[PDB]
Design a protein around this ligand. Structure first.
Ligand SMILES: [Ca+2]
Ligand SMILES: [Ca+2]
Length: 86
């Protein structure tokens, strides 16, 4: 795990990580695919109760990505988005 991600991911409980993984898993053929598309990214986030804006999704992709998102990238983007609730 990348050390910077490792600390975003430290915000999450084991249970949150498990929940987040179950939602992510809906959007891949896990037997052969480890990444969701950038279009699916907002879908999985919204499944988990987040409401990222279109500019924000592109910004997170620019800043987090190592057109695709794997599970740890997804966790970091969830953590970022969870901090913009009002
Ligand atoms: Ca729970
Ligand atoms: Ca659940």
């Amino acid at each position: 795990m990348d050390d910077i991600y490792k600390a975003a991911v430290e915000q999450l409980t084991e249970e949150q990580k498990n929940e987040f993984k179950a939602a992510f898993d809906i959007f891949v053929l896990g037997a052969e695919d480890g990444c969701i598309s950038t279009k699916e990214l907002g879908k999985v986030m919204r499944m988990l109760g987040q409401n990222p804006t279109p500019e924000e999704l592109q910004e997170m992709i620019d800043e987090v990505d190592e057109g695709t998102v794997d599970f740890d990238e997804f966790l970091v983007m969830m953590v970022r988005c969870m901090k913009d609730d009002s």
